[PDB]
Amino acid sequence: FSTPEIKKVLNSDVAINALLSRLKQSLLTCEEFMKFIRKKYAFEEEHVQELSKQYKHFFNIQNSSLKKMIHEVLGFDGKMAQVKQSYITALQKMYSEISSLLLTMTKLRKSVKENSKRLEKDVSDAIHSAEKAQSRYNSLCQDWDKLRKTKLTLRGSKTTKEQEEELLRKIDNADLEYKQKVDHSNSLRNTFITKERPRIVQELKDLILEIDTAMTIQLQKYTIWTENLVLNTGVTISPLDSTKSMKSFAGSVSNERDLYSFLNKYNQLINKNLIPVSYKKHP
Ligand X SMILES: O=P(O)(O)O[C@H]1[C@H](OP(=O)(O)O)[C@@H](OP(=O)(O)O)[C@H](OP(=O)(O)O)[C@@H](OP(=O)(O)O)[C@H]1OP(=O)(O)O
Residues 74-113 vs a copy of itself: string with x where CB under 8 A? x-xx------------------------------------
Residues 194-213 that bind a copy of itself (CB under 8 A): 205, 208-209, 212-213
The nearest distance, CB 113 to ligand X, in angstroms, is 5
Question: Which of 67, 68, 113, 136 lies at the binding interface for a copy of itself (CB under 8 A)?
Answer: 67
The nearest distance, CB 112 to ligand X, in angstroms, is 10
Q: Per rule CB under 8 A, is residue 130 in the interface with a copy of itself?
A: yes
Question: Which of 22, 79, 113, 170 lies at the binding interface for ligand X (CB under 6 A)?
Answer: 113
Given the complex with a copy of itself, which of 108 and 175 has the nearer CB atom?
175
Residues 6 or more apart whose Cβ sits within 8 Å of residue 56: 74, 78
Question: Which of 22, 24, 179, 205 lies at the binding interface for ligand X (CB under 6 A)?
Answer: 24
Residues 16-45 vs a copy of itself: string with x where CB under 8 A? --xx--x------x--xx-xx--xx--x--
Neighbours of 211 (CB within 10 A): 22
- Judged by the rule CB under 6 A, the positions of this chain that interact with ligand X are 20, 24, 113
